[PDB]
Design an enzyme around this catalytic site. Structure first.
Site, PDB file in Angstrom:
ATOM      1  N   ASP A   1     -16.071  -4.309   9.851  1.00  0.00           N
ATOM      2  CA  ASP A   1     -15.182  -3.285   9.303  1.00  0.00           C
ATOM      3  C   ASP A   1     -15.161  -1.988  10.124  1.00  0.00           C
ATOM      4  OD1 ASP A   1     -13.610  -1.669   7.795  1.00  0.00           O
ATOM      5  OD2 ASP A   1     -14.887  -1.533   6.059  1.00  0.00           O
TER       6      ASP A   1
ATOM      7  N   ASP B   1      -8.207   0.247  10.509  1.00  0.00           N
ATOM      8  CA  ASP B   1      -9.173  -0.211   9.513  1.00  0.00           C
ATOM      9  C   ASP B   1      -9.106  -1.730   9.215  1.00  0.00           C
ATOM     10  OD1 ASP B   1     -10.888  -0.291   7.290  1.00  0.00           O
ATOM     11  OD2 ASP B   1      -9.371   0.287   5.897  1.00  0.00           O
TER      12      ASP B   1
HETATM   13  C1  LIG Z   1      -7.149  -4.534  -5.733  1.00  0.00           C
HETATM   14  O1  LIG Z   1      -7.870  -3.767  -5.042  1.00  0.00           O
HETATM   15  C2  LIG Z   1      -8.299  -4.307  -3.974  1.00  0.00           C
HETATM   16  O2  LIG Z   1      -7.585  -5.038  -3.230  1.00  0.00           O
HETATM   17  C3  LIG Z   1      -9.742  -4.079  -3.522  1.00  0.00           C
HETATM   18  C4  LIG Z   1     -10.428  -2.830  -4.115  1.00  0.00           C
HETATM   19  O3  LIG Z   1      -9.468  -1.854  -4.510  1.00  0.00           O
HETATM   20  C5  LIG Z   1     -11.446  -2.212  -3.135  1.00  0.00           C
HETATM   21  N1  LIG Z   1     -10.747  -1.682  -1.985  1.00  0.00           N
HETATM   22  C6  LIG Z   1     -10.956  -2.119  -0.618  1.00  0.00           C
HETATM   23  O4  LIG Z   1     -11.753  -3.014  -0.327  1.00  0.00           O
HETATM   24  C7  LIG Z   1     -10.030  -1.516   0.438  1.00  0.00           C
HETATM   25  C8  LIG Z   1      -8.791  -2.387   0.647  1.00  0.00           C
HETATM   26  N2  LIG Z   1     -10.754  -1.276   1.677  1.00  0.00           N
HETATM   27  C9  LIG Z   1     -11.933  -0.424   1.759  1.00  0.00           C
HETATM   28  O5  LIG Z   1     -12.393   0.150   0.763  1.00  0.00           O
HETATM   29  C10 LIG Z   1     -12.747  -0.454   3.048  1.00  0.00           C
HETATM   30  C11 LIG Z   1     -12.199   0.499   4.113  1.00  0.00           C
HETATM   31  O6  LIG Z   1     -12.778   0.128   5.358  1.00  0.00           O
HETATM   32  C12 LIG Z   1     -12.488   1.978   3.774  1.00  0.00           C
HETATM   33  N3  LIG Z   1     -13.870   2.281   4.103  1.00  0.00           N
HETATM   34  C13 LIG Z   1     -14.750   2.997   3.204  1.00  0.00           C
HETATM   35  O7  LIG Z   1     -14.342   3.425   2.119  1.00  0.00           O
HETATM   36  C14 LIG Z   1     -16.172   3.283   3.691  1.00  0.00           C
HETATM   37  N4  LIG Z   1     -16.298   4.733   3.783  1.00  0.00           N
HETATM   38  C15 LIG Z   1     -16.581   5.456   5.011  1.00  0.00           C
HETATM   39  O8  LIG Z   1     -16.787   4.862   6.059  1.00  0.00           O
HETATM   40  C16 LIG Z   1     -16.319   6.961   5.088  1.00  0.00           C
HETATM   41  N5  LIG Z   1     -17.553   7.537   5.599  1.00  0.00           N
HETATM   42  C17 LIG Z   1     -18.584   8.077   4.732  1.00  0.00           C
HETATM   43  O9  LIG Z   1     -18.402   8.162   3.522  1.00  0.00           O
HETATM   44  C18 LIG Z   1     -20.015   7.984   5.246  1.00  0.00           C
HETATM   45  C19 LIG Z   1     -20.892   6.964   4.519  1.00  0.00           C
HETATM   46  C20 LIG Z   1     -20.413   5.527   4.737  1.00  0.00           C
HETATM   47  C21 LIG Z   1     -22.346   7.146   4.944  1.00  0.00           C
HETATM   48  C22 LIG Z   1     -15.101   7.312   5.961  1.00  0.00           C
HETATM   49  C23 LIG Z   1     -14.877   8.825   6.061  1.00  0.00           C
HETATM   50  C24 LIG Z   1     -13.835   6.611   5.465  1.00  0.00           C
HETATM   51  C25 LIG Z   1     -17.221   2.640   2.771  1.00  0.00           C
HETATM   52  C26 LIG Z   1     -18.644   2.965   3.222  1.00  0.00           C
HETATM   53  C27 LIG Z   1     -17.016   1.129   2.633  1.00  0.00           C
HETATM   54  C28 LIG Z   1     -11.545   2.998   4.441  1.00  0.00           C
HETATM   55  F1  LIG Z   1     -11.714   3.037   5.755  1.00  0.00           F
HETATM   56  F2  LIG Z   1     -11.787   4.212   3.955  1.00  0.00           F
HETATM   57  F3  LIG Z   1     -10.295   2.651   4.172  1.00  0.00           F
HETATM   58  C29 LIG Z   1     -12.298  -1.069  -3.716  1.00  0.00           C
HETATM   59  F4  LIG Z   1     -11.566  -0.003  -4.019  1.00  0.00           F
HETATM   60  F5  LIG Z   1     -13.189  -0.688  -2.817  1.00  0.00           F
HETATM   61  F6  LIG Z   1     -12.923  -1.484  -4.802  1.00  0.00           F
END
Ligand SMILES: COC(=O)C[C@H](O)[C@@H](NC(=O)[C@H](C)NC(=O)C[C@H](O)[C@@H](NC(=O)[C@@H](NC(=O)[C@@H](NC(=O)CC(C)C)C(C)C)C(C)C)C(F)(F)F)C(F)(F)F
Ligand SMILES: COC(=O)C[C@H](O)[C@@H](NC(=O)[C@H](C)NC(=O)C[C@H](O)[C@@H](NC(=O)[C@@H](NC(=O)[C@@H](NC(=O)CC(C)C)C(C)C)C(C)C)C(F)(F)F)C(F)(F)F
Lengths: 329, 329
Positions: free
Chosen positions: A214, A34
């Site tokens: 991503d 990721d």
């Molecule tokens: C202090 O906190 C912080 O440093 C940042 C903050 O916590 C932030 N977190 C982030 O940015 C974190 C580090 N990274 C992440 O959230 C991004 C990742 O690529 C993530 N991706 C996702 O959560 C993505 N989800 C998807 O791709 C999922 N697929 C589905 O739900 C389908 C839909 C996209 C149509 C997969 C089954 C995982 C969405 C669409 C962005 C996964 F891979 F799950 F780990 C958030 F929570 F989102 F607000």
């Protein structure tokens, strides 16, 4: 061959995973690899929660290189939350390895329904240090500072469903994965792999949009207003209150995404952002696109983009390389 | 006539809305009237987001009764977030009025794409004080303290699409909305309108389930594990990437929810909870049963439940009345 690889396995059309291991006894796990995050976690044998039932679990006691830490952590994602504590141990990716700090998850209830529905065990972040919790240096950065690889970069060649498998290559660029030239785009910040591109679809334009490459996002993500104007008089049905967009696969109005810079032009035609849903109805597809607003107008170039384009993620030179992925190896 | 009756308009048996005003000029608005939250908010004229551009906006300087507060607030919901600041003014609901503290909203992107795609401007919460932000006493509680109504209670007769309109009645129960006996269920907390029922779908049983009766939820919401068991004896179509399912609406094997207590038995058949998507395909439907995990195992009985059952929300007696809604007025 000369760099180290990790085979990527298509999981029934949606996501791809790769295997790595933890402990001097190995202990294999399946990961979402990721670029959109920067922490490594792995479900612990001390996990008490329903989601861990079907998972490979990590046993620190079977590892001579394990080093206790125990600091509590919560790991937040758009799709859920996962908590545990920090540990350190030999992490191995391909046949490269290093002592690495990571999270032993003991609670996955905030990560459902996804975790129980999926066959991955953990998530291996490939982002930048500022994106991490507990300020962990990225795996590929640390490997290079220890001189286990020539270059601090890695590379994604995604698997395609029926056609072929994929590869995450660490340390060097391999000609076999792409055709035509690589074009590099400098990061606007050292956080996500985020570059600046003009985003053009209909006669809609967003100049100087922040684009995030991503691998852990399964859709193309688009600004809410931009998506709304995009679909104006395409013949696409947004099922009420759902991010569920249905068209005829053949809809001749479906636009091509165009992202441009001084160095290059990258497109995503309907064939790359449409998913067949024949079981739903004949000739029907769904747009693998989500509307999502960030503080600053932002696209996520997720897997549908990376399926078309081989990508190079270069820490040394703070940039992303992009080239057309070879259809077959 | 005697109570305060506020008309409700249907949207496709998915959601319903009702109007209310702010300021001493009208300044009308369409709201989600929402028993699952406890705050009132309206989009400011000082909001410039693309969502607000399509909505009725609230001009605080076209009304003598406005009293600035200015404090920042983040209103959080399961489905999205809205930001703004506190203000105070005359809220007119039906034919009654009161000085009321409420949120003037200037950022709506956290609630997109739903907000722009729907016809509501704001959300009028009808929950308890402890669920609110800014510890605001509910409209109906304050309306009773000011002896403008007989009882601190309100009632929902939801509209059904090609059949009738609905009403939110404040102040008393009116016989015309239901047939059969009313059955009261005690609240387990003064937070949501939450009561304790045994929930079963034929062998999948979750006894003493926490059940939230929520007028601003378009689905039946269910523990993730519970959804997984129901799916085991179905053969429906998983929408790729999303936690949604497609059936034929006449699928005979679809589950009837049963909810029992000492006081009564409530069922909910597929004809009430399914979401028709006729414009995608003939006879086609979304399951509209949604996995959602709370700290406590919980059901949200949303609109599908309340279209079948007339409901009574009684602050004085800390309970919820339930009766079969009249099929036509
Ligand atoms: C202090 O906190 C912080 O440093 C940042 C903050 O916590 C932030 N977190 C982030 O940015 C974190 C580090 N990274 C992440 O959230 C991004 C990742 O690529 C993530 N991706 C996702 O959560 C993505 N989800 C998807 O791709 C999922 N697929 C589905 O739900 C389908 C839909 C996209 C149509 C997969 C089954 C995982 C969405 C669409 C962005 C996964 F891979 F799950 F780990 C958030 F929570 F989102 F607000
Ligand atoms: C107890 O105190 C807390 O825990 C507060 C906490 O901030 C909490 N917030 C809440 O519980 C707040 C107060 N109330 C609420 O979130 C419940 C409201 O009825 C809400 N309803 C919802 O958020 C519900 N949303 C829906 O039903 C939406 N429908 C869809 O998205 C389709 C899906 C059901 C598939 C509507 C079209 C908006 C979900 C499914 C529960 C709506 F009406 F939108 F305002 C949350 F943010 F979720 F964490």
């Amino acid at each position: 061959s000369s760099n180290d690889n990790i085979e990527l396995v298509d999981f029934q059309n949606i996501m791809f995973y790769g295997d790595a291991e933890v402990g001097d006894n190995q202990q294999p796990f399946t990961f979402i690899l990721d670029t959109g995050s920067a922490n490594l976690w792995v479900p612990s044998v001390k996990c008490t929660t329903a989601g861990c039932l079907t998972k490979h679990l990590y046993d620190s006691s079977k590892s001579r290189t394990y080093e206790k830490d125990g600091t509590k952590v919560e790991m937040n994602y758009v799709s859920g939350t996962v908590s545990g504590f920090f540990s350190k141990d030999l992490v191995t990716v391909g046949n490269l390895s290093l002592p690495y700090k990571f999270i032993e998850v003991i609670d996955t209830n905030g990560f459902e329904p996804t975790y129980t529905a999926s066959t991955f065990d953990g998530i291996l972040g490939l982002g930048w240090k500022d994106l991490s919790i507990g300020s962990v240096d990225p795996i590929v950065v640390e490997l290079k500072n220890q001189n286990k690889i020539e270059n601090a970069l890695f590379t994604f060649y995604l698997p395609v469903h029926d056609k072929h498998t994929g590869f995450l290559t660490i340390g060097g660029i391999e000609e076999r994965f792409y055709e035509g030239p690589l074009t590099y785009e400098k990061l606007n910040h050292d956080l996500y792999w985020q570059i600046t591109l003009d985003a053009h679809v209909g006669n809609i334009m967003l100049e100087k949009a922040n684009c995030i490459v991503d691998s852990g996002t399964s859709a193309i993500t688009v600004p809410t207003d931009f998506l709304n104007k995009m679909l104006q008089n395409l013949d696409v049905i947004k099922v009420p209150f759902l991010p569920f967009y249905v068209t005829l696969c053949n809809n001749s109005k479906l636009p091509t995404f165009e992202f441009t810079s001084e160095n290059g032009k990258y497109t995503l035609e309907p064939e790359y952002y449409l998913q067949h849903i024949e079981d739903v109805g004949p000739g029907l597809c769904m747009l693998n696109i989500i509307g999502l607003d960030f503080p600053v107008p932002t696209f996520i170039l997720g897997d549908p983009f990376m399926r078309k384009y081989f990508t190079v993620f270069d820490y040394d030179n703070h940039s992303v390389g992009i080239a057309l992925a070879k259809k077959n190896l």
